[PDB]
Amino acid sequence: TSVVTAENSSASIATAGIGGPPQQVDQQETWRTNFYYNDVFTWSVADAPGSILYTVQHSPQNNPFTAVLSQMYAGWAGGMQFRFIVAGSGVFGGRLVAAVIPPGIEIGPGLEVRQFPHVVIDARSLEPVTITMPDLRPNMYHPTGDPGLVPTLVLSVYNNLINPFGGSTSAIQVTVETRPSEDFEFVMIRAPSSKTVDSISPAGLLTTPVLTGVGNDNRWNGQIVGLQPVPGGFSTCNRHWNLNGSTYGWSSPRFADIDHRRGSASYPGNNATNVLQFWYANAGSAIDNPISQVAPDGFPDMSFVPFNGPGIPAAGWVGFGAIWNSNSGAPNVTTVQAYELGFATGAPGNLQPTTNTSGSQTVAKSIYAVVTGTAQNPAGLFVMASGVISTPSANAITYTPQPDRIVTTPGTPAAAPVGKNTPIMFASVVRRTGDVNATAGSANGTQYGTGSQPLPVTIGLSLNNYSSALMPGQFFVWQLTFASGFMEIGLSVDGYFYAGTGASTTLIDLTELIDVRPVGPRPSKSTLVFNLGG
């Protein structure tokens, strides 16, 4: 089998002798003679002629085996060979161009790839097309850590893609493969435990069990069993971390406790027997929380439901807790009950739900009768962070919370549909008070509690910084494999998750899900696939 060498190979070998003798240069090695998979991209029917579809810089990371071998060498030099495989069909038409751009030239909309030395790729070609990229560098070698100037391989559209049949299919996948050239080499062996600065990637945060095993949401510690899309948009900022090392709100990600110390207490009725205790404090008095002063840690981020009398209010956040006095306080014996927490205004008069955090006031009204009711000015709440949802009857109401009921702070970004992509919202099986035995079987549908992101992810992303791991304008993409179908999921730079379901409101069950696999950063204009079993 013939191996291709570069046009500048004799000058490339000699000037790299400042790094010593060449290493890993043996032309009969099996890691060097075969082509291996590198990447994949999409060619669409809506791409104008002259648009750039693929761009890669010269690097030893565009090959699975030179990336492993670069962990123990401080330097590289030489060329690299590329190969393009179109999936295609015999009813399509259109061509593409690929050329190597020297250093010093822009890559952008004004680049005329068709007047460089190029190759032409057909939309219905069966045999792959090959192009070689030499190492055109102003340095003697490329040190690992700070390489310098490199050439760039650019793929553009020559003639636009045409489907004369009609609808349905409107996109083609193209696969890139790579083997090194004859003149590629390494220099200057080093410790493999040394500089571990490798393109940090947000691929290891979403693995397989995360979705078919352990894994919870930011509202409840319940198992994620299904994803539900919502068209239009939503906003949530309780435990929601974006791709930077920052967040907008209180409640660090742990379901430990809800604790506050100062706040007024009262109760209605002139009798201290079988009443509903009412505790309320304003926003801005959470001194014990080191993150935000707006609310104590673990407070829910949905609005209050205005109810009165002995009827259990629909939806909401109910949790098992008690009251406790101040001044090295021990909690009172005769008041432990389920309390309904939320945000309201105008208490203790007309209690109205509110949208915004500013100008609001946290409240806590008990849903069941308590024999004793206090009226002391210093009081607090000790409520477990895990709770349930109150219901009047068993039935099946709706997924909770609705996108309009979520309380957000000023300065929060909103999720918006881009193209056919629609923001999704992870669901889970939870318990209720209308029926304790919420088995996922017969006796009507079960209750679904919906959060923003998998708590696991938040845990693994709150440590590291992902500012340069994803360029703005793209999503980090995974591919979910089911038993009789497959799907595609996105993650924006702002912390949200998307899928290309369109304008549909049907739940997707993660029962026959087998495994996940990372794809990479992909542009938001491309529609994510929805080839499901139905």
Binding site: S10, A11, A14, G17
Partner: peptide, 10 residues
């Protein structure tokens, strides 16, 4: 110095 140009010539 001579070996460098000699190798590049050869």
């Amino acid at each position: 110095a001579a070996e460098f140009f000699e190798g590049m010539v050869h």
